[PDB]
Nucleic acid binder design. Structure first.
Ligand SMILES: Nc1ncnc2c1ncn2[C@@H]1O[C@H](COP(=O)(O)OP(=O)(O)OP(=O)(O)O)[C@@H](O)[C@H]1O
Ligand SMILES: [Ca+2]
Ligand SMILES: [Ca+2]
Ligand SMILES: [Ca+2]
Length: 341
DNA sequence: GGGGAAGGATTCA
DNA sequence: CTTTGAATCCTTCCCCC
């Protein structure tokens, strides 16, 4: 099959440039402020002008400002980004009915029935890029290959504002020369476990005892990597349906006082119920981040949908359970809804 | 023995 | 004193449907 993956470039920061054109060419840093003190929080994303200097996703705002004190720092406006995203995703549906929106700035299109070979696929990619740029003024990077994993890898290799095809021969080459830590789904934790087994390339996963691999990184990831190594990886492009929606918020001051936490929890519940919109959850989990950054949760599943009134009384019961089964103080508190009707 | 659901922790991004 | 949303993975346990 032929897969065409679209990845919006430094998306949040690019949208802010689209809304304020004079920002282009200047380092722009979109931040997620937490409210614990002046500039507390981290960078959500930065444009390349900022990344060039080390200011990137994940570094503390305070740190970023030490590197680029005169950069433009903007608060994250997720709603705006989500609406621009939605409009771009609609443009993409016009190129294939088989589309998988993987996130706010990523989507896979199965274009097998639209093009005959990679040359045509490439031309369709330029067409898609021109279209998005024309309608929304947003640049994207297109990756094209035989399956979702290599289509994503192609985009990783070509971003920003690029387009790349990874034909069958290059797939075989990558299976031998690509750093396994660069394979989608393999984060830091897994990359290190793999490194401790002397595995640095997909190909390496074949010449090892399966139970040794499975025992180290889990059965699912082991089978996943081996299938990629056997060039036998296959996963169809399917419509994504979110399976859980929730919100967890950092508090003013750590605590284990029920009456003092209710407000924050109820806040997360109202914001969660807003995002649900029509979706009716049968399950609820209360999640707490401890003073020392540990994450603990308690949940419950009901035989029917959970009205917000039910969510309110039940969340307290679940938070009480955590408070009781854990001596530590809570830093962050939130709720998570799932098992939608 | 193993399907399948539920409760939690882990991992990815 | 870095976010923080969501899927994935690991155990346990019921049940023989
Ligand atoms: N610790 C983290 N590591 C990686 N991604 C994170 C983390 N915390 C949040 N994210 C979310 O992931 C986004 C980064 O994912 P990813 O690396 O796939 O984006 P991208 O398309 O490469 O990046 P960009 O938007 O910066 O151009 C941001 C947000
Ligand atoms: Ca992106
Ligand atoms: Ca992304
Ligand atoms: Ca833990």
């Amino acid at each position: 099959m032929i897969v065409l993956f679209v990845d919006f470039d430094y998306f949040y920061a690019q949208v802010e440039e689209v809304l304020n054109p004079s920002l282009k060419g200047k380092p722009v840093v979109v931040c997620v402020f937490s409210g614990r003190f002046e500039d507390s929080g981290a960078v959500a994303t930065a444009n390349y002008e900022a990344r060039k200097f080390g200011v990137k996703a994940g570094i503390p705002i305070v740190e970023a400002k030490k590197i680029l004190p005169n950069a433009v720092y903007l608060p994250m406006r997720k709603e705006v980004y989500q609406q621009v995203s939605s409009r771009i995703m609609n443009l993409l549906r016009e190129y294939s009915e088989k589309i998988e929106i993987a996130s706010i700035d990523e989507a896979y299109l199965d274009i097998s029935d639209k093009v005959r070979d990679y040359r045509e696929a490439y031309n369709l990619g330029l067409e898609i890029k021109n279209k998005i740029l024309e309608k929304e003024k947003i640049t994207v990077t297109v990756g094209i290959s035989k399956n979702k994993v290599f289509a994503k890898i192609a985009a990783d290799m070509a971003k920003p504002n690029g387009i790349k095809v990874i034909d069958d021969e290059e797939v075989k080459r990558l299976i031998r020369e690509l750093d396994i830590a660069d394979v989608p789904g393999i984060g830091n934790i897994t990359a290190e476990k793999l490194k401790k087994l002397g595995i640095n390339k997909l190909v390496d996963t074949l010449s090892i005892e399966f139970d040794k691999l499975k025992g180290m990184i889990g059965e699912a990831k082991a089978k996943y990597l081996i299938s990629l190594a056997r060039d036998e990886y296959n996963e169809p492009i399917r419509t994504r349906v979110r399976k859980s929606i929730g919100r967890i918020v950092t508090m003013k001051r750590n605590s284990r006082n029920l009456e003092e936490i209710k407000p924050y929890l109820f806040r997360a519940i109202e914001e969660s119920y807003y995002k649900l919109d029509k979706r009716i959850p049968k399950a609820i989990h209360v999640v707490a981040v401890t003073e020392d950054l540990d994450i603990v949760s308690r949940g419950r599943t009901f035989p029917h949908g959970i009205s917000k009134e039910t969510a309110y009384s039940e969340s307290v019961k679940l938070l009480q359970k955590i408070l009781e089964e854990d001596e530590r103080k809570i830093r962050r508190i939130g709720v998570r809804f799932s098992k939608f009707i």
